[PDB]
């Protein structure tokens, strides 16, 4: 079965930069496609970004697109979710999720399969 984690919250200063984990099961990575979600104080959970696991390419959601990038390890367990030149706004709980390629829009939550339980990260002044 496929089991996605989270990890590399915590608490980070504005404008400064930190790397998400996802790890997954297998060859979970190797089969299903990535995305990107989180969660704000309040508000709905919303995309972030999009990593198509058949050539590699990235796709961002405006929020921050040019701050924050995606990859994947050598041994493709997991996907990793760079940020750079935090702001106090990008406080939210992150979650990665997975689907099956070629299954609707990869912007939509309701096209993916499984889920992680997120991770916390708290940007302050």
């Known amino acids: 079965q496929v089991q996605l984690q989270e990890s590399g919250g915590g608490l980070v200063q504005a404008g400064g930069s930190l790397r998400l984990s996802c790890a997954a099961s297998?060859?979970?990575?190797?089969?299903?496609?990535v995305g990107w979600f989180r969660q704000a104080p309040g508000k709905e959970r919303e995309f972030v970004g999009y990593?198509?696991?058949?050539?590699?390419?990235?796709y961002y959601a405006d929020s921050v697109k040019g701050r924050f990038t995606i990859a994947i390890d050598n041994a493709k367990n997991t996907v990793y979710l760079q940020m750079n030149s935090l702001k106090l706004d990008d406080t939210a709980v992150y979650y990665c999720?997975?689907?099956?390629?070629?299954?609707?829009?990869?912007?939509?939550?309701?096209?993916?399969?499984?889920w992680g339980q997120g991770t916390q990260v708290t940007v302050s002044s």
């Open positions: 999720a997975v689907r099956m390629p070629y299954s609707g829009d990869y912007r939509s939550s309701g096209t993916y399969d499984y």
């Open positions: 990593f198509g696991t058949r050539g590699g390419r990235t």
């Open positions: 297998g060859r979970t990575f190797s089969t299903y496609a």
